[PDB]
Structure formats: C-alpha cells, structure tokens
C-alpha cells in the first residue's frame, strides 16, 4: 500500500491457484503404449 519491507518476492509467488499434477501419475499415461 505505502511501504515497509521487501514485498517483491510475494509478487513472484502470485495468488493461490493452479493446475494439478503428480510427480509419477503422469507415467501411467505412458503405459497406454505398453501392452497389458
């Protein structure tokens, strides 16, 4: 609003909200090629 401390970093964090994605689940998609 007026001033204070370094509030720049918070500007890079942006607002809460985004897409969902796991660090492994995606692999499952690659299974679509491999036979069952």
């Amino acid at each position: 609003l007026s001033g204070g401390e370094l509030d720049k970093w918070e500007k890079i964090r942006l607002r809460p909200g985004g897409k969902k994605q796991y660090k492994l689940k995606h692999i499952v998609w690659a299974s679509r090629e491999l036979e069952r």
Binding site: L6, K23, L34
Partner: protein, 148 residues
Amino acid sequence: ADQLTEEQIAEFKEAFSLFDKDGDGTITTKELGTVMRSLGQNPTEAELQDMINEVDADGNGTIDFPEFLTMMARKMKDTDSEEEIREAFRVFDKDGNGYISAAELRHVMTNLGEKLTDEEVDEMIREADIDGDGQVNYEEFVQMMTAK
C-alpha cells in the same frame, strides 16, 4: 454421489499390476525404473526416489496398492500450487541450468514492469538464498513460492 466403486477401482487396481513385474505388492525403484525405461523415461537416481517419495505415505520407499490408487485419485482436487512452482521455475530458467541468479531474477522482474537494479535484486537473492551459497536454487525457490 462423489465416490468410487469396485467398477472404478477394478480399473486402477489393474494399473498397479502393470507396474508390478514381480507382483510382490510393492513397487520399488528397480521395478519402477525398469517400466519407465520401456516408456522412454530415464530419470536420475535422485529423481526416481523423488517420484516414489511423493506417493510414499507410509515412508517405506515403495508404492503400495492404495498408494498407487490414491495418486490418481488426488487428480480430483488439492495439490496444484506445486505445479506453479515447477512451471514458474522453468519460465524463469533461461539458461535452463536449473538455478536462479541475480542476473536472471533481475530480468524476470523487468517483464513484470518493476524498475529494479543490481543492488535491489541483492535483497531478493539474499532472502531465497537459505544455504547462503550466493544463488537461488530450486529447493529455495520452492520454499519461497510455497511460503510467504
């Protein structure tokens, strides 16, 4: 309703067996790293442990039956801010070195329209620089993006 039945689970349960070669009931780095190979994904030793660690709720170092299922279930909701951390990092990573410095950071702030100099950026890097290495690493970038 918002729930899962034997019909929906019957499908997911089939996925586990696909990754489970020895069919021991738990997916390990040896069994995982193998499947990923045929898929065309050769991650690093540290990366592999990371992927499994995520789903690792009981902290055993392997993907259990429900551990693999719950993973696909999470897709419903929750767990999203994390993506913004990885995406943003890549969006700022020009040299693609996987590290952010005062030179790169200063360039990112410019795109936003914030007049900042080298002396100013120093205050930023100093904040993210937890280990005091002189730069901002992913580990620090994730904490700064997840925290306030």
